[PDB]
Each structure stands twice: as C-alpha cells, then as structure tokens.
Symmetry: C5
Subunit: 366 residues, 5 copies
C-alpha cells in the first residue's frame, strides 16, 4: 500500500502537483508500456502516411480520419468508466474491512479467559493462535503474497500457526472444500472447554467470546465471497471494449493530415499529439485504476500489505493475552484529581490557534 | 459464477485485453445473436439502397439518414443505463449477502449443544439439518437450478434434508403461503427442548442460538423479498426502449450514403460500420450486464452457484457439529512461547519485498 | 407488485424485448394519456401551420422552431432525472425493508413463551396479535389499500386484530397523535407478566423478546417517518419543470417545416415525429417511474401488496405459535449418519452441469 | 414539513402536474425574488440595447452576446449540482434518522422498571423525562424553532422537562462545553439505583436499559455532529459560483439581438426569454433544493417539525410508562381460536382486487 | 472546522451569495496563488503574442489556439472530478464517525463500576483515562495538530493521560508496531479486576463494558486504517492530470486572437478572460475540495478540530464518572403528574406557527 497521507495534510499551492512526480503505485508505472504501444501505432500510421501511402490512397485515408473523429464518442466512455470504477472502489474498500483482524478478540480473551498458571496462558495463547490460523488459511487462499509465503500446510506448521499434531486433525477431515473454518470450530471447542473448567467464570463472558468469533469468521467468510464472486466478466469486458474502441477511432481520427489538402480543422502538424496522449493518461489511466483494485490481494505496490497484517496480528495478540494479562500498574490518583477542569496543557506550537470559544450549537449566538 | 480473479491480480500490460478472448460468461456469448440481427437489418437496408431503391426514393432515403443521425442521442442513453445498472449490481450483490449460509450457526451449535452420546449428536445433527432444510426450501423457490434438483418435496426427502415423518408434519399445516419458515420454527422447538433437558447448559448459550437463527432466517426472508419485489417493470422498460430506440435511429442514421450525391460528412463506404458495431458492444452490452444480474439465480454461467452452496453448507456443517464436536488436539506450547516476538518466518520468494519499516502513523516521520 | 422474475432468469435473444408487450405495471399503462395529449398539441400545431397560419406568420413561426430546437437541452434533463429517481428507488426499497413483518418475533414467542395449556397458548396468541395489530394500525395510516379495508377501528375489531374490550382501552387514552405504538406497549406489559408467572423461564429469554420488539416497532416507526417526511416538494417540482419545459421547447422545436422555404436540417415531413415520441417514452417515462414509487403504498399494479402481507403475517404467526408449538417429529438418524460425505444426490436434468471441481481459492491453480 | 404523499399515491394523468400549483414549500416561494432580479437585469440590458446603446457600441455588444453564449457551459453545471445535492439529501435524511425519539426507550422502561405505587411510577416518569430533557437540550442547540421556544434553561424548567432543583445540579457542573449529555448520565444513575432497590428485577433487564440509552444518546450525539460538521464551505461555494457564473454568461449570451444586423441563430425577438426563465427554474431551483436542506432544522415550510416531535415524544412516553403500565385487558380467545386459517375478512371496496393466487416463488409455475 | 450552519438555516434571497464573501476555509484562500499563476502564464502568453511574436509565427500561433480549443474536453473532467470527490467526502465523513469518543463508555462506567470511596472513584477515573489515553495515542499518529501537542510520550505523561509508572509498562513491551491498542488491554484487565472485587455487581454489567470498549477501539482501529489505506495514488493522479491538462489546452485555446486576421468565433479582446477564470474557480476549485478532505486531520481551517475533542472528551468524562456518580436530585412529582396531557407550553414567538392539526397518516383525510 502506497501511503502519501502526510504529504496531503494541508491544501497548499503545489498540493496535488507534487504527486505527479511519484513513481511507486503511480500512473506512469502502469501506463509506460501502453503509451509506447500507442505511440508505436500512431507513428507507424503517420510515417506511412507521409512516405508509404501514395496519392490515390492518401485521399482515401483522409476520408477515414474525418470519419473516425466524428465517432470518437469520448463522452459515453466516462460513464461506463465512472460507474464501473466506483463499483470497484466500493468492493476494494469492503475487502479491507473484511480483513481478519484479531484485535476485537484479543480484548475478550484477556478479559474472560483467566488463570496465571501455565494452563491459564496456554488457553489464551491457543485461542488466539486458532484465530491467527484461520486468518492465514483464508489469506493464503485469496492473496498471492501470502501463498508465496505458505505454499503448503507444512509452511504454516513450520511458521508456528499450526502444530504438528493439529495437522493430523486438519488433514483427516474428509472435506473437498476449503478448510479455513476449521480453526474457528476449534475455537468453540476450546472456549466451551475452558468455560466448563472454570477458566471463563461468567456465562455472559462465554457468550461474548462466541459473539466476537462470529464477527471474526464472517470476516474470513467475506474474503472467500469476494474472491469467488468477482464483478461480472460481461461488465468488465464492456468497459474494456469502450475504452479500447474509443482509442481505435482516436488513433486514426486524431491523425495530423496535410494542411494544403484543404480540410476543416486540420491546419497544423504538431509532430506528436500531446493533447491526445493526455487523453490516454485520463481515459486509459482511469481503467488502470480499476485494473489495480479488481484484485487488491496481489503484489502491486498499492495492493494490501497482507503479510504485514499477518505478522502484526500474530505478535500483538500474543503480546496482549500472554505478557499483558493482569499485569497492570498500581492505581494512583490522576493529575486532575482535585481539579474540576481536566484540561490537558498545550505546547508552544499548538498554542495560539486554540483561542476559539467552544462551539455549543448553531442557535447560541456566541 | 465465472471466477477470473487470479488473472487480474496485478496490473500488467495486457491486463484487461486478455479478458476480451474469454467465452464463458462473456459479452460475445450474450451478443452474438443480436449483432447477427443488427447486421441482418443493416445489410438488408444497404443492399436495398444500392439495388432495390430507385433514384426518386434514393433521394428521399438520404433525407432520412440525416434526420435519424441528428436524433441519435447517444449521451442520454448512458445515464438511463448508468443509474439502472448500478441499481442492479447493488441488488445482485445484496442477494448474495442474503444467501442462507449455516456457518455462523454451526459454531454456536457445536459450542452450546453438548453431549457425546447418540442423543447428543442427534440434537446437533437435527438442528443443522433444520437450518439446511430451510435453505433448500427457499432456494428451490427463488432459483431455477435448485428447483430442477428438487421439483417436489419428495425430492427433498430422498435427498436427506427432510425425513419421511417430517413431511407429514410439513404437509398437514394448512397454510396457503410458502413454508420455508417451517424448519426455523422446528429449530426453536428443538433448541428449547435441548435447553430444558440440559443439553444447552447456560441461559445465554440458548439466547445466542435464537439470536443466530433470526440472522439466518432473515437471510431466507430477504431472498423471498428480492424474488417477489423485483425492480419496477416501468423502470426496466424505459431502459429497454432507450437503447433500442437509439439503435433504431442509429440503424438508419449511420447508413453509408453515395458520396457523389453531395452530402456533408458522408464521403466514404467502409462496407461494414465497424465503429457502429463497437457502439453495439458498448451500449447493448451494457444492457446485457443488467439482463444477466436481474435474476442471478437462473442458470447463466455468471449466475450464483446455488447448488454448490447447498452441498457445501450441508457437508461442512455435519462435519463440524458431529465429527468435530469436542475432538481437539491436546494443548501444547507454541513455537514462540518464550520468544517475545511471535514473528513467523518468510520464504525465499517473499523475502526481499519485506524490508519496509513498519508504518506507525502519518505524523511519525520515519 | 408486478413480478416478472421468472421471465428474466437467463439472458436470451429476446430477453428484454418480450417485456415491451406487457401491460400490467407497464410504461404504456401510465403514458397512453400523455402521448394522446402530446400528439394532441403537436397535430394541432402542424394542422394550423399548413392551413390556419398565413404566409406572413408562417415565416415568423419558422423563426421560432429554430429558436426552440437550439434550447432543447436534452442532456441536463437526464441528470435531474438520474439523481432524483435513484433517490426515489432508494426510498422505495427502504420502505419495503421497513414493512412490519412478525416473522422474527414468531420464532422468539414459540421458543420462550411456554405452556401447553389454554393459558399457555393464549399468551402466544395475544403476543402475536399485538404485533399484528400494531402493523395494521400503521399500514392503515400509510397505505390506501389497507385503509379501504379498515376505515374505522371497528373494522379492525370485526376483523379480529382487536377485541371489543381492548378498544375501550385503546380509545380512552387521551392522545392527539397516532396510536400505532399502543399494541407495542401492550406487548411489553404482557411479556413482563408472562415472565413473572414463569411462562418465560429464563432472563435472557425475556430480554430477547423486548429486543426483537424494538426491531419490530422501529419498522412501524420508520413507515410513519417515510409517510410524513417525503422527498422535498422543491425537489419534485424542479424535475417536473425540467421535463415539461424540455417538452415545451421540443413540442415546437421539432415541428416539421416546409422544405422549399430553405432552412438547414429541415428537408422532410414524416407526418408523425416517431423519434420524438420515442423521446417521450424515455424522458417522460423516466419521470413516471418516480411517479409510481414516490408513494409505493397506493393502489397501483406495481405498488406494495400490503393487504397480502397483513393476511400472511397474521395466519403464519398464529400457525407457528399455537399449532406448531412443541409439536415436533421424533428424532431419528439422518440419511448420512454413517457417511462422511453428506452429499445430496442430483436429478437427471441438473446432472452434467455439475462436473466442475470445487473452487478453493484464486491462488490454488486447480 | 410539507406532506403531499396522499396526492401522489397512484400515478394518474395529471400526476406531477398538479404539484406545480402548490405554494407551501414550493419552488415559486423560494425563487420569486430571484426571477424578479433576473428579469430586472435582463430588461435593464435589453432596454439599454434598444435605446441607450448607440450604434458604435451596439456592434461591440453584439460581439459579446456571441462570446457569452458559446461559454454557456450548461452541461458541467448539472454535475456539480447533481453530486452536491445528493450529498445534501443524504445528510438531510440521516439528520432525521438521528432525531432523538424516546419510543424505543418507553417500551423498555414500562417492561423492566416495575412498581404500582407512587415511587414505582415516579421512577418511570423521571427516566422518561431525563430522555425527554436530553432531547430538548440538543434540539435547542441545533434547531431555531426549539430555541425560540426555549431561549434559556428557565424556559425548560417552566415547561416541565427540568425541575427547579435539577437546574442547581445542571448549572453547578463546571463544564465549558454543551451539556446535552448531562440527563443521559442522570438516566444511568437512576437506572442503577432502581436496579439496586429491586425495581428492575433481572440483570439483563438492566443491561437492556443501558443498551437502549446508548442508542438514544448517540442520536443526540449525531445531531451535534451534523450541526458542527456541515458540508465544506469550499464545496458549497463551488456550486454557488458554477450556477451564478453560468447565469452571468446566460444573462448576456441569451440576449435577443437585432435580426437585420445579420447574425447566425438570432432572427427573432420574443420580448421575454421564456425558455431561459425555464432554465432558471431548473438550474437555480436545483440549487434552492440544497439551500433548504443544508440546515433542515430552521423554520422553512419543508423543514423538520422539531417542536411537534418534542411535544409528541413527551406526551406519548408519559402516557405509556405511567398510565399504561400493567393496565391490560383480560386475556380471552381470539376470533380464530378454532379456525386453522386466521384470515381476516375483506370489505366490498377491497374485494375483487384480491383474487390473485398466492406468490410462492419464481420457479413454481402457478 | 468552519461552521456556518446558523447562516444557512432558512433559504433567503441572498442565501448562498453571502457565503461567497467569507475567507476562513473558503475557495479564495486556497486558489489565490493558482489564479496568480494562471494569469501569470496567460498574460505572459498574450503580451508575447502582441509584442514578442513576429508575423510569421503569429500565424502559426493562431493555428494552435484553434487546435487547443477543440480538444478542451471540459465535459469528461466533471466525471473524474464528480466520482472522485464523492469518494473523498464519503471517506471524510466516515473518518469523523470513526473519531474515538468516550461518551458511550462514560455512561456504562458510571452505571456499572460502583463505589463512593477513594478506590471506587479511582476505578472509574482510571477506566476513563485508559479510554482517553488510547484516543490520544491514535490521534497523535494520524493528526498533525495532536502530534504538535504530543511529540513524545513524555508530553502525554506531563499532560496527565499516562502516569510515570505506566510508561515503564508501555515502553517495555517489545512491539515494533503502533501501541494505541495497549490502553484498551489495560481497560480489560481493570474491568475484570473490578468485576472480581465486586465493584461491577452483575455479570451483564461486565459484558456491556467489554462490548462498549470493542465499539470504542474499532473506532481507534478505523482511524489507523484510513491513515494507512488512503485512496489510490493512481486514482489521485488521474484526476490531477485531467484538470491540469484541461487547463493546458484552455490556457492556449482560450487566447484572444487578433480580430482582423479573419478567424471564426474570435472577434473581440476582453483584455482578461473573465469567463475562463470563472472556469478556474469551478474546475480547479472542485479539485481543491478533495485536496482539503484527503487528509482531514491536518491543520486547515476546515479540518477536524482534534485537539478540541481531546480536551472535551477528557473533561466531560472525568466530570461524569467522578463528580456525577450517584449524585442525583431527589425524586419529586413532575409538572404534569395529574394532567393526562404532558404538553409543554409555548412562548410568544413560537406561538402562531403551531396551529396545524397533528399528522396521523396519509390516508386520514383530516
Ligand atoms: Ca491488485
Ligand atoms: Ca441471470
Ligand atoms: Ca404508488
Ligand atoms: Ca432549512
Ligand atoms: Ca486537510
Ligand atoms: Cl446479551
């Protein structure tokens, strides 16, 4: 994921114009091979029109430039690009909200599954490893960067998510489908065993763990749904036709003709159609937005860092439920225990922009 | 469902242009009969204009080509296509999220309904079969591919979802409406019987089962709502008129006239209007997107695989609540039990793209 | 509601073109009186131009046809129609999801309110009648078809939703507002009485009934909100002006002039502007979409069948909580009790389209 | 709020054309002063062109009419109006769903807080008054019509929402911010006191009251968020510039020139540009839609009736939790106690439109 | 945040035209440097065309003005601006709803965590400080104005959110990632300690605190997701190219040529292209809307007041859970204890606009 949020914090003079010189995840990284092909077919059509095309067919070619330019319907391309791309960014953002994060589950495990002994932390470490295993098994199904890290189940056993004796349980289940759900059933069999032994003391404390797991698996179940049910291929191919057929009538219809032939609106030869290549940055570059986000789990520069989130949500959960269980600082009085205004002080930099009176509503004329 | 997600993982040079040669669920599979009819009425109008139409009516026909081309309002067709199709893909995706999946219910049944004996697994197998029966009864109402698998209720009894003695209970309920809800009431009468016998030990454990069933039936209730309440026929017929009346003024208005007659912008004869057929791929093909997703439960190639999800969610639930109930591997220490960094190792392929420092926020200039 | 979902299951050759011959809920049922008025003012303007208009004002009329056609801004009408109609279909679908359905409440009443005696079924029948009464009282406020069935409260008492002695309780509450909430307060006073008597055994079982009622009343409360807060009249009148003022400049600007006068683009007389009436099907018919869904509770053919849902959700709830309470078939083994694959068999028709290998993810190259 | 829902129940011949004669909340009530200014600057520019402008500058003025008409970009105004207004109607409807309604809380108070004595109804009346006070304190902050009813806190004490001794508690909290939250903390301190005294019998009954209050305050917290965080002023000023700069190039570019001067497309003098004023109804009237809904809590005719909802949700809650607590009619048998079909009868008017067979699904060919 | 809601309460004559003279957060504050550069390159191109450009290249320059004006595709810029900006305002508003507010948690802490002694208020003050610390640690990661207030963790310790002995616990956790979650795990370890000691009396009272914390942290977790996963840089650069390449063909294509040269539509010299600068307010100003909301946590005038919400939600929570715990006014009878109509009185200003009869539904013809 290309993060440029700190560059665009405040709207400056050169706000978005400094963004046109970046390379990682940019438009020029995706379109430098297509503009070489577009100039490769434009210069092959102009150098043949000046040199190869003879005079009887130079008149016929000029009858085709005025035919292709009038059919260059550049308006209706913007709606089959406009409505298709916002369908894509809607699915691209909903695929990130469906990423399996164990952060809502690591606060319930550390709050409900109790015990300071070896078995007490073994329950909290295995419950979070079962959540971490079920996120590895679904991300290695939908993302190429995780599958290159875990090509086999033995690469998951060697990584520490699965043990050697859980793989005998995992591989002896006669199921012809994907088995990312398996660790989520091991979560329920272990949370019901810890509830029976008294590790989970209350009854609502056990219900919250099974509530917060169905929020976590549905996230694993949605990633399998977005991977299987993509956008319709008939709807991807319409947008691909509409851009490339516009760029077929514009490859010929924007050819620079001979001025002395005597044709309307064709009186110059720029030697390079610079306001046509800038249409190729805008029309074809709008398609390359949706080419990058149609599968955000690949290995593009602006794709989702799925291997970052696996190592993060495996380390910060084992830190939270094993090393941070019931290890608190002792309770002392706050800095504003006797002050009726718990107002934190300011620095010198954020000091004179903070003199506005408090907004209390639109009707109170302050 | 046509899945092409692995082809479009990273944006390449020939990224979406390789998609224009696929056949299953494509645009050419849906439009090869219409372009034959469109060329069948274009070539019947051109071969009559050169040969059948005499000179007094060849002048009158040329007065009609310039009349139909100026009314070829290709711009306003893109908005009655643009706003109607995104209404359709919104309903097409919401009909997939309303698909009855028993995965959120198979984790509560294996966690709350207990017992290792024959009656203990008979409760878990009948509770999941009642969820699986209520998904069969609603999918055979809304989807053609399931109704060809279950034309009668006896085809559901022979398949194993309903027993022979439950059909006497199912068919003696004097109700003139659809009875997909029936197994969801059998779920509540069986979950309250297992709670009374002590199979469901806690009180919040019984409340979670009735909570997770109302999430499951509302999914069965939404599929009946999308099947009954389709998009308005007055709104389908406006889009169908607007495309086919544009293609009536474009069938005549884009005719290739005689150049020597002396008319503006009509100086050539391509013998095949290739930039008009490419408008037929884009305008009529945009309508065939919404023709395929207006009922996604049919038997198209890009329709929902409803019979896959019936056999999957009947097999993986009976595997989870009967064979996987309280059958865990024994608890042992993890690979990172003494390591303060639970960091899984990497392979050689995903090795040198993983050297970025960890993103901690936009304000920390790293 | 006009349901045509079975006709549009698979995209055929004549897929949407068979829809243009339907009559119920169609475009021709709504626009046959307006095209008679539109031709009534077009033919009154043409037959006066040939016969009534003399030569000094036939030149002045021709100066007005070329003035009205250049102001025929057919493009900006499509956006005040495009954005207004999708606001309308968004409210039209959200008014159907806010329809009071007692199906999520009939599963909690049959699962929590217990008792096989006369008082045990009287509690379940009165709790569901109080939900059914509160849906009648809100639908007779917002829908014309229910108010013609229940013009007075005595028509609700005679129908069986309210008793004769509940109407004395209903009509002696000194409230000047709508009283659809009243039965939802009778639900809470009866669910707390059954909980106190031991009919509702558990404490979470009583909390689920008050949870599922606030989901049900908010649905009754949303129908009162959509009925009171419609779309803004200033926003309805802008779209009505923009279509009818476009059809004023197009009623005169698309008049067929005399060819020998010598004017550009006016060289024919079709005797009937067929590509202008087809613009009246598309522009005015787009407005008649939003004319039908601005109040979907009327008595149009494509309006909501509110009287169907009253009789359905009153019959299937009394069937579920009175005749179906704790009346189950006895537990027996399933058809796949010893088989590790619970795979239901197929027919002969859905037999050879089911040979695809199971999709397990995009990265597994199968 | 202007409610016209009963007029638009069924799509008639004069369906939306009867709406163009209404006055309350209409387009003519908002635009009668602007069309007087628009004609005031059009007639001041035409009567100066015929009379004041001499012949050497009548030629220069005619060079400016053809310059302003070609820059009259009426297309791109419809998208900065189209996307801005649907952002506004999205916020205008979400501000109505965030209106603090005590109806979901009056059913939990009457169901959980018990007692028939004086203290038993004093708990239910004070808990609902604390919800009603917290809605008054947020609506008098965000709405002008409530602030004109409660300019001071003593106008709230005299109205009965706050007592004289609660104002000493309210005004001695040293907080410089808005204090609409205060009564919601008084709700929790009173619900925990009634739970301790045994007025709230169960433990889940107390959890539902604190659950349903956080749904109620977040509604009060969202109204403070929409009042403080409006739409961006840079995004309001772009739409205001784009309409008023289009109406500057159209004020001059649509001037009726002298026909004998010899200019293209300018051959008449209508003496009043009627298809330009109809563009002022459509373009400027689209802006006046968003001028009315940018703050829906003012005192327009189509604004939210906030003082209606204060008096309604203060009267129907005190009626529900004080006069309607545990005052039920006695349980008797329904009208369909022995009938297996609980089908309510029909009238004579809704009698022959009810003969359709019941829809059971798309696949059942009925 | 620039709040102007009180100015736009009612739609007046000069409603939005008074907004075009504001300066804070306006369009002129963001675009006064770009119109100086745009006039700086327009006047450098006109003063070179009159004076520097000689007659042989004054003819070649005039061949380029008519070439750049025909490629000035001002229509397709409005859709790559229209669909990109509403993606931005969707993320800008969802980043405000994901702001960590402790108001839903301060009502559960004051209602469940009990005790009037020193340890009883120390539990409520430390639980709310742990929520307030976790909002400081995520806002100093994503917002520049908070990071200038807390550049180090010692600036948070000196401010009072963290103690000196909690920083030893905070900095000895060997984690290479962001540690905003840490105080949310300290919340669970303290809420489970207070539940064990009997400070939290009930079991559902403890479950509500862990429920309302996962609502609060997911808000802290969403701010880290919006900061890391911005909009795609390929999609920001397409919109930046499309505006700046339109303003390259419009910088040259809208040049005022010499009238006597003899070119179509170029007959005047305004000496300042006022309807082109007004296109720069509309096209480039539409981009500066999305330049300000792409990171709403900076230090613009219309950015989010993040330091206001830190001091507010730290003061009003310590006021609610420490000074306002179980300190109620005594219960007395309301003003409408014997009146069956709890109708609050009106003033004189809001007196004669309140005579409408109560809306009870669309079907009741009142
Ligand atoms: Ca990708
Ligand atoms: Ca289909
Ligand atoms: Ca209707
Ligand atoms: Ca207003
Ligand atoms: Ca900013
Ligand atoms: Cl609960």
């Amino acid at each position: 994921t290309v993060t440029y949020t700190a560059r665009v914090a405040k709207a400056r003079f050169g706000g978005f114009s400094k963004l046109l010189l970046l390379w990682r995840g940019s438009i020029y990284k995706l379109l430098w091979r297509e503009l070489l092909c577009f100039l490769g077919l434009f210069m092959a059509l102009s150098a043949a029109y000046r040199f190869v095309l003879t005079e009887e067919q130079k008149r016929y070619f000029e009858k085709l430039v005025l035919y292709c330019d009038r059919y260059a319907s550049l308006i209706p391309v913007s709606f089959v690009l406009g409505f298709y791309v916002t369908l894509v960014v809607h699915r691209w953002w909903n695929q990130y909200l469906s990423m399996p994060l164990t952060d809502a589950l690591m606060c319930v495990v550390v709050g409900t599954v109790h015990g300071h002994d070896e078995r007490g932390r073994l329950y909290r470490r295995t419950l979070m490893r079962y959540a971490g295993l079920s996120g590895v098994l679904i991300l290695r199904s939908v993302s190429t960067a995780v599958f290159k890290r875990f090509p086999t189940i033995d690469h998951v056993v060697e990584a520490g998510f699965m043990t050697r004796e859980e793989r005998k349980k995992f591989e002896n289940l006669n199921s012809s489908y994907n088995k990312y759900w398996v660790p989520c059933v091991w979560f329920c069999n272990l949370a019901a065993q810890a509830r029976r032994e008294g590790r989970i003391r209350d009854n609502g404390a056990f219900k919250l763990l099974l509530e917060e797991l169905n929020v976590f698996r549905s996230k694993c179940g949605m990633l399998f749904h977005y991977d299987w049910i993509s956008v319709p291929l008939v709807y991807t191919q319409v947008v691909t036709i509409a851009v490339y057929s516009y760029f077929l009538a514009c490859l010929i219809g924007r050819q620079f003709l001979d001025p002395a032939q005597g044709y309307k609106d064709h009186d110059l030869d720029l030697c390079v159609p610079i306001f046509t290549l800038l249409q190729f940055f805008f029309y074809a570059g709008w398609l390359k937005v949706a080419e990058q986000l149609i599968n955000p789990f690949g290995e593009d520069d602006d794709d989702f860092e799925t291997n970052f989130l696996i190592d993060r949500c495996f380390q910060v959960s084992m830190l939270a439920v094993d090393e941070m269980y019931d290890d608190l600082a002792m309770l002392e009085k706050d800095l504003y225990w006797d002050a009726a205004e718990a107002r934190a002080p300011y620095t010198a930099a954020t000091a004179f922009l903070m003199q506005q009176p408090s907004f209390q509503g639109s009707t109170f004329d302050i």
